[PDB]
């Protein structure tokens, strides 16, 4: 899987970036030099970088199905389907058609949808014929008391608003009620059980500390006083066209904290972490 991203600053922005994108809510996951957007990546990349399973945010597209007491509907099942849709990721569910008297050929279709929703049908007919990824369900040679199966795939191009639509077999009063819901929000751990999180001077939002006014840093550890945020950054960059701590460190309250390496011999040092040694 692949994840294309650009300067993502929230869990939702990461999920909206593509079905292959996952978000790491792990505290202090972004080491010195690493921006918040590093938290957004493919799952095996985050796992490699030490993000645990309980810290990887990755909601998926899924289908929930329900049958009524079944005195209500004979030929189409299930009667109720709930879809949670993540943008770009298809949700699949099967609709069973059971012939009573009816028709030799059966078509499965849905009412008009917004352009943000894409629906295709696979047709697993009883006569051996199999259609895949069609705009409609289509099965000829349908016989009484031998069920046929249609696989419905629904894909949203965005975080859609909650809506419903129906799936019907042409020539029949039967209705499959389909409720669709967005799957774009992340269920992250909050601040409730620790007042020391973000030094108690900021809001914890999916691994990111949104520091209170007068506080900066990845953990809101630096109180700025009247010293401006840029003033403390100036002691961390060599010139005005350069990047803070040579992109290899964090500016911790006016001073660069350099990235430490596990690679033997590697040492990142200097006022701006500008010395990259291979033989230390
Ligand atoms: C996160 O890093 C900060 C260092 O600024 C540390 O004080 C805090 O205990 C860390 N939290 C963890 C490891 O959960
Ligand atoms: C639908 O049914 C077909 C054949 O019975 C099966 O191959 C497919 O996995 C089913 N789809 C789902 C989502 O269960
Ligand atoms: C220094 O660089 C910053 C870039 O964020 C810019 O906003 C600022 O105007 C620059 N200062 C001068 C004197 O060029």
From Swiss-Prot:
Residues 188-221, 222-274 form the I-EGF domain. Glycans are attached at residues 28, 94, 240. Disulfide bonds join 3-21, 11-186, 14-40, 24-51, 125-139, 159-184, 188-206, 198-209, 211-220, 222-253, 236-251, 245-256, 258-273. A motif (Cell attachment site) lies at residues 136-138. Residues 2-52 form the PSI domain. The modification Pyrrolidone carboxylic acid is found at residue 1. One of its GO terms (molecular function) is cell adhesion molecule binding. Leukocytes. Expressed in neutrophils (at protein level). The VWFA domain (or beta I domain) contains three cation-binding sites: the ligand-associated metal ion-binding site (LIMBS or SyMBS), the metal ion-dependent adhesion site (MIDAS), and the adjacent MIDAS site (ADMIDAS). This domain is also part of the ligand-binding site. Heterodimer of an alpha and a beta subunit. The ITGB2 beta subunit associates with the ITGAL, ITGAM, ITGAX or ITGAD alpha subunits. Found in a complex with CD177 and ITGAM/CD11b. Interacts with FGR. Interacts with COPS5 and RANBP9. Interacts with FLNA (via filamin repeats 4, 9, 12, 17, 19, 21, and 23). Interacts with THBD. Belongs to the integrin beta chain family. This is Integrin beta-2. The lineage of its organism: Eukaryota, Metazoa, Chordata, Craniata, Vertebrata. The gene is ITGB2. The chain holds residues 23 to 535 of 769 of the full protein.
